[PDB]
Structures are given as C-alpha cells and as structure tokens.
Amino acid sequence: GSSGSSGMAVFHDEVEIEDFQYDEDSETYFYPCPCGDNFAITKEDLENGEDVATCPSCSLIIKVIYDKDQFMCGETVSGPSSG
Length: 83
Ligand SMILES: [Zn+2]
Fold this sequence. Notes:
This protein is α+β, with helices and mostly antiparallel strands. The chain has one domain (1-83): Roll (Microbial ribonuclease fold), CATH 3.10.660.10. 12% of the residues lie in helices and 23% in strands. It has a 3-stranded mixed β-sheet, with no helix packed on it. A two-stranded antiparallel ribbon has the order 2-3. Strand 2 and strand 3 form a beta hairpin. Zinc ion (ZN) is lined by residues 33, 35-37, 55, 57-58, 60.
C-alpha cells in the first residue's frame, strides 16, 4: 500500500576531503575503507554537490567534508566581471 519514505541515508563516517587522496591522473579522490577497497569519488561528483564516496567492494558511502566554495568557485557565471 502506502510505502512513504523511499530510502534511508546511512553513512559510515563524515571525513573531510583534506584526508582524501586526490589523483590528478583521473581527478578522483580516494579513502581507506574499513572493508578493504578504497572509496572513490570523481571530482565532478563533488562539484555537483554529491559529497559521497562509494566503495567498489562494499559500496559504503561516507560524508565528504569539503569547502563548497572551493569546488563551486569556477563555473559561476560572470556578471559584475569578477576577477
Ligand atoms: Zn568498502
């Protein structure tokens, strides 16, 4: 019948990107998973406002604490001629 809520936000731990390991090679961050495989989150995903790293093993999801301003600042349209 009426299911209601669809899905449940269950994270393992909120880690700051500062701890993650950015790899220019594939512009993708990494993190040590308590299961085995190291998490992975494409820089793009972050900019889009994801802040979630999935594991190719357990598929765990953690909260990536990063400066939204840092990622955001870049594509922001140009009006007053910022610079
Ligand atoms: Zn894992």
